[PDB]
């Protein structure tokens, strides 16, 4: 506790800040929810081959979902504009980034280098450079120093449920990183060990049970769909046993909320 | 772009890029401007440093002004100070420092650096070299090239860390895990420095860093350091030397003043004090802003 409480303060105000914008697919032009869920999916993938961290993957998504918020893009230029995004997270998260050819030769050529440059130059002048976004992943990491006593499953699970929420634009565009992480580490939690979202975390974060019912259904719903929904990355990634194979784990039939 | 600006003389050469003094042709004033020649793109000292300093506003953290951004250039725009701790140190040769001026940088360097813990960033090269004092009596941290946000807890982060002779003791044993403690560390030997005016562990390599500060400090058992001897660059064949008198460490300080550097040079990671804790400190209990000469 230096500066838990200092931090996860700033997280909090820094989160309303970095918000994407909840409508923007709706003035999207040309690309949809679906694609958006496909591009994603891909940079799961993507990843997992070149073994970048889960926060990497979390922040090249708020970096697409905030450049879409403002940047109309075609569908054939969609790639390009996460491509840029996972190399703009990998610098700024990574120990050893990928090289930019790495990320050239996994478009399968669809796009130069160049043009990765181009784009990455690009994202940065819409984002203002602004890269140090609070993500779910950040918030649950201290929800985990919460728990009575610490449980790999709960955690890999918590990060499983948080990381299916990537995908889908609606419902998830709509909610805040400290609330899908709220809702994943208690469904993590009641899961495995049939406990709740501890009182301790509602002194620290403000959030109920009752605050959080709203994301809590929805991603009940997510884990109940996921061996039905179209994109399968992270279903297949935490199948590994890094992750204690949790998304073997059966959802709960329901939540008694 | 840099339309504005007219060149006055080259300050000399960061983490990465290339640093000159300028001034705005329009409102007079006095900027740093770091060009960075555009490979790989946009090196992500430079992304980490933008983000982060346009995050971090404080009274004692050098003020990012602006980032013009061309296809061909990236140039940082920092407000101008006049010189870094080391100039001033090397100028104070046969005066040294008046302790009301060592107490003042410190307590602001200290102010700082626990903004920077609050806001989530690990500064992770501090020296006198990236510490800036102007004429009235402030000190700033500055590069923030090999700075990065932390999570809570920390993951680990690159091993290649810290101008050698700030460097902790948890980073050379090869620790997974360090933290917010390996700044507070080298503004210890900052301390040290300012009142002495010569490096307090200038080593030459790892393993002669080390056995400095265990000739400083005593070697650490598994009393004073939970844990060190289990920790991957120990070496149990480690000389085992006393634990000198902390009088003798900096012989000029006073009692209050010996405590604090002793809490920011405690071995244990987590038992040595933080920034925001030491500002509490009776060191400070008369500190005031005294201009330098
Ligand atoms: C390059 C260099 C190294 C370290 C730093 Cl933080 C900076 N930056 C950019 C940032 N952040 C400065 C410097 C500065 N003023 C200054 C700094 C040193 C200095 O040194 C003078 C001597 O010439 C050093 N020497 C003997 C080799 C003179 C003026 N004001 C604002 N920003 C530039
Ligand atoms: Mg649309």
Same mark, same amino acid.
């Given at each position: *506790? /230096? ?37 994603? /999916? ?55 980034? *990928?090289?930019? @050819?790495? $990320?050239?030769?996994?478009?399968? /050529? ?18 203002? $450079? ?27 699970? @918590?990060? $499983?449920?948080?990381?299916? %929420?990537?995908?889908? @634009? /609606? *419902? ?5 990183? %400290? ?5 994943? $580490? ?24 009752? %605050? ?17 929904? @179209?994109?399968? %990355? ?24 | ?64 002004? &602006? ?11 920092? =407000? ?8 001033? #140190? ?79 003791? =948890? ?11 390996? &700044? ?46 289990? #920790? +991957? &660059? ?29 809490? #920011?040079?405690?071995?244990? +990671? ?15 209990? &008369? ?7």
């Amino acid at each position: *506790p /230096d500066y838990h409480e200092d931090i996860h303060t700033y997280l909090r105000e820094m989160e309303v800040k970095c918000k994407p914008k909840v409508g923007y697919m709706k003035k999207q032009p040309d690309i949809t929810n679906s694609m958006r869920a496909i591009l994603v /999916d891909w940079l799961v993938e993507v990843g997992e081959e070149y073994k970048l961290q889960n926060e990497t993957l979390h922040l090249a998504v708020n970096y697409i979902d905030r450049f879409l918020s403002s940047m109309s893009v075609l569908r054939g230029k969609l790639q390009l504009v996460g491509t840029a995004a996972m190399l703009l997270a990998s610098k700024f998260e990574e120990i050893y980034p *990928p090289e930019v @050819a790495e $990320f050239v030769y996994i478009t399968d /050529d669809t796009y130069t280098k160049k043009q990765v440059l181009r784009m990455e130059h690009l994202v940065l002048k819409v984002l203002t $450079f602004d890269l140090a976004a609070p993500t779910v992943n950040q918030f649950l990491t201290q929800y985990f120093l919460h728990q009575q006593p610490a449980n790999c499953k709960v955690e890999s699970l @918590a990060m $499983f449920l948080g990381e299916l %929420s990537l995908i889908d @634009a /609606d *419902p998830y565009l709509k909610y805040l990183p %400290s609330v899908i992480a709220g809702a994943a $580490f208690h469904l993590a939690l009641y899961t495995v060990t049939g406990q709740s979202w501890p009182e301790s975390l509602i002194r620290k974060t403000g959030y109920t049970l009752e %605050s959080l019912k709203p994301c809590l259904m929805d991603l009940h719903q997510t884990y109940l769909k996921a061996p039905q929904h @179209a994109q399968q %990355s992270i279903r297949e990634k935490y199948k590994n046993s890094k992750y204690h194979g949790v998304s073997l784990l059966n959802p709960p039939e329901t939540l008694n909320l | 772009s840099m339309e504005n600006f007219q060149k006055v003389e080259k300050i000399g050469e960061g983490t990465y890029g290339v640093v000159y003094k300028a001034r705005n042709k329009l409102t007079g004033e006095v900027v740093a401007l770091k060009k960075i020649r555009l490979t790989e793109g946009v090196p992500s000292t430079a992304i980490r440093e933008i983000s982060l300093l346009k995050e971090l506003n404080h009274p004692n953290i050098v003020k990012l002004l &602006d980032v013009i951004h061309t296809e061909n250039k990236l140039y940082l725009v920092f =407000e101008f100070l006049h010189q870094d701790l080391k100039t001033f #140190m090397d100028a104070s040769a046969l005066t040294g420092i008046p302790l009301p001026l060592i107490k003042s940088y410190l307590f602001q360097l200290l102010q700082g650096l626990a903004f920077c813990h609050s806001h989530r960033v690990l500064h992770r090269d501090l020296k006198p070299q990236n510490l800036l004092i102007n004429t009235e009596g402030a000190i700033k941290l500055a590069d923030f090239g090999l700075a990065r946000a932390f999570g809570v807890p920390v993951r680990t982060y690159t091993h290649e860390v810290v101008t050698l002779w700030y460097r902790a003791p =948890e980073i050379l044993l090869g620790c997974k895990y360090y933290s917010t403690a390996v &700044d507070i560390w080298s503004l210890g030997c900052i301390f040290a420095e300012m009142v002495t005016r010569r490096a307090l562990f200038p080593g030459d390599s790892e393993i002669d860093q080390l056995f400095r500060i265990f000739r400083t400090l005593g070697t650490p058992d598994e009393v004073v350091w939970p844990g060190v001897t289990s #920790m +991957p &660059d120990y070496k149990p064949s480690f000389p085992k030397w006393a634990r000198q008198d902390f009088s003798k460490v900096v012989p000029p300080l006073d009692e209050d003043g010996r405590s604090l550097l002793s809490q #920011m040079l405690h071995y244990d +990671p987590n038992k040595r004090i933080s920034a925001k804790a030491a500002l509490a400190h009776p060191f400070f209990q &008369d500190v005031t802003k005294p201009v330098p000469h």
